C-alpha cells in the first residue's frame, strides 16, 4: 500500500505505516514491542536532529574556516572561558533541557508549562514534536514535513559517520575529501586503498595521532575499531 525499503517485500506485522518515514524496515524486529518502539521513535528523532545540525555545522566550518580541521576543532579552539568553564555551563544547561524532554516522554503533558512565567504553556502535542514556541512557522502540512524531517535526518546520520571514517582514513574534511575523489575517482575509493584476501590483509593507516596533548594533559585519540578495518 506504501513504498517499501525493499520493493516487493512484505513489511513486518508490527509496522503498519502509522509513523512518518515508515518504510517497513525492521529486519531484526527491534520495534516489535510497543513500549520499546515509543522509546526508539523518540531516539531516532533526537539522533537525526543532532546529526543534521552537526553535518551542516561541519560543512560551514570548512567553508568559513578552511584552515582548521573539524576533527581537531576541539583542541584548536581557544576561548577565554577555558575548558572547564565551558563544560560546566554545558552540563547544567543540557541537564535541564534533557530532563524536561525526558519527563514529557515518560508522562506526556506534564512539562508543557513554563516554570517561571505562569501564563505561557505549550499546547497539547505529540511526544517528540513540541509545537508552540518551538514551531513559530510551519511552511506546510505537518504530515509531509514530518516525512521530510526524518528522511533528511536519516541521511545526515549516515553523512556524519561518513565524515568520521573519511577523516580517520584520509585526514581531510568532507569537502577536501570529496575533491580528492573527483581528482582520481578510480584510485581514491575505499576499494582502491584497502583489500583483504586469504593470506594477506591490507588496511589504510590511521591518519589521527594516537594521543593529543591539551593544556598539560594527554587525551587519547584512537581510530574507531581500527583492528577491524578492511
Amino acid at each position: 500500500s506504501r513504498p517499501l525499503w525493499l520493493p516487493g517485500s512484505t513489511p513486518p506485522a508490527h509496522l503498519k505505516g502509522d509513523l512518518p518515514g515508515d518504510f517497513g524496515f525492521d529486519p531484526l524486529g527491534l520495534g516489535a514491542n510497543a513500549e520499546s518502539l515509543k522509546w526508539f521513535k523518540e531516539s531516532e528523532l533526537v539522533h537525526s536532529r543532532w546529526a543534521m545540525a552537526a553535518v551542516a555545522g561541519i560543512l560551514v566550518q570548512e567553508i568559513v574556516r578552511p584552515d582548521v580541521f573539524w576533527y581537531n576543532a576541539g583542541k584548536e579552539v581557544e576561548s577565554p572561558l577555558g575548558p572547564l568553564g565551558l563544560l560546566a555551563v554545558e552540563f547544567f544547561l543540557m541537564h535541564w533541557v534533557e530532563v524536561r524532554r525526558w519527563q514529557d516522554l515518560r508522562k506526556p503533558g506534564s512539562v508543557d508549562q513554563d516554570p517561571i512565567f505562569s501564563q505561557y504553556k505549550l499546547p497539547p502535542h505529540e511526544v517528540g514534536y513540541p509545537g508552540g514556541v518551538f514551531a513559530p512557522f510551519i511552511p506546510g502540512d505537518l504530515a509531509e514535513l514530518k516525512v521530510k524531517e526524518i528522511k533528511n535526518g536519516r541521511l545526515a546520520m549516515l553523512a556524519f559517520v561518513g565524515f568520521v571514517m573519511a577523516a580517520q582514513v584520509t585526514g581531510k574534511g568532507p569537502i577536501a575529501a570529496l575533491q580528492e575523489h573527483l581528482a582520481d575517482p578510480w584510485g581514491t575509493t575505499i576499494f582502491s586503498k584497502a583489500a583483504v584476501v586469504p593470506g594477506q590483509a591490507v588496511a589504510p593507516p590511521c591518519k589521527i595521532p594516537a594521543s593529543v596533548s591539551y593544556k598539560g594533559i594527554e587525551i587519547p585519540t584512537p581510530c574507531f575499531l581500527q583492528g577491524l578495518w578492511p
Binding site: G82, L84, G85, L86, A88, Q103, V111
Partner: protein
C-alpha cells in the same frame, strides 16, 4: 496519590500521599521515604525548624562580621575567621562559657520539649504567674512574647513558607562553609571574591583538580 495542585520538586512526578501539604514547604520531596511514618514525621518537622533557625542565625553570624571587616569597620573581633573564633581571647575562658551555655540551654530546651509532648502546657511563666502565652499556639510557633510585633497575625501560611524556604537555603549555606573552608582554607566571602574575579577558571572542578 499526592494532590496535583500542590507544587512539586519534580514537575510531573508521582509523589507520596502522606505529604499532603499541611506542613510548610511541602513539595513532596522524600525519595528515601524517611517521613513515611507519621510519628517520625512529627519529630522531623520540628527538627527541620530547629536546624533551620540555628543555621539562619549562624550564616548571618558568619557573613555580616566578615562583611563589616571588609568594609572597614574596626572592632576587637574584626578580621577573625569564623573557624578561628574559638581560639580568640574573651573575658572568660571558653570552658566556663560552655558551662554557662549548657545550663541556660537546658532550661529553655526542656521548656520547649515540654510543649512538644503536651502542647500548651508550658505557656505560663513559672515565677510571675500572671504572664502567659496565648492558648492557641502550636509546637514550633510559640508566639506571644516571642512575636512582639504581631507578624503572626497576618498571612501566617505564607510567612511559614518564607521561613522554611530561607531556612533550607541557610542550611545549605552552612554546609558550604564547612566544605569550602575545608578544601580552600579561606573565609566564605574571600571564596566569593575569587569566583567573581575569574568565574570561568574558579569552579570546584578547576580547584579540586589542581589539588588532586
Amino acid at each position: 496519590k499526592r494532590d496535583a495542585a500542590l507544587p512539586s520538586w519534580m514537575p510531573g512526578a508521582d509523589l507520596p500521599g502522606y505529604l499532603n501539604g499541611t506542613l510548610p514547604g511541602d513539595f513532596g520531596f522524600d525519595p528515601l521515604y524517611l517521613g513515611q511514618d507519621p510519628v517520625k514525621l512529627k519529630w522531623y518537622a520540628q527538627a527541620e525548624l530547629m536546624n533551620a533557625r540555628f543555621a539562619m542565625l549562624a550564616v548571618a553570624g558568619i557573613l555580616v562580621p566578615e562583611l563589616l571587616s571588609n568594609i572597614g569597620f574596626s572592632w576587637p573581633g574584626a578580621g577573625v575567621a569564623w573557624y578561628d573564633a574559638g581560639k580568640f581571647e574573651y573575658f572568660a575562658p571558653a570552658s566556663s562559657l560552655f558551662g554557662v551555655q549548657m545550663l541556660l540551654f537546658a532550661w529553655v530546651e526542656i521548656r520547649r520539649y515540654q510543649d512538644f509532648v503536651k502542647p500548651g502546657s508550658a505557656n505560663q511563666d513559672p515565677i510571675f504567674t500572671n504572664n502567659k502565652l496565648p492558648d492557641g499556639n502550636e509546637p514550633g510557633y510559640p508566639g506571644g512574647i516571642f512575636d512582639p510585633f504581631g507578624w503572626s497575625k497576618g498571612d501566617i501560611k505564607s510567612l511559614k513558607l518564607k521561613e522554611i524556604k530561607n531556612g533550607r537555603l541557610a542550611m545549605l549555606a552552612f554546609a558550604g562553609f564547612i566544605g569550602q573552608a575545608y578544601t580552600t582554607g579561606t573565609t566564605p566571602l574571600k571564596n566569593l571574591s575569587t569566583h567573581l574575579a575569574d568565574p570561568w577558571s574558579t569552579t570546584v572542578w578547576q580547584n579540586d583538580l589542581a589539588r588532586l
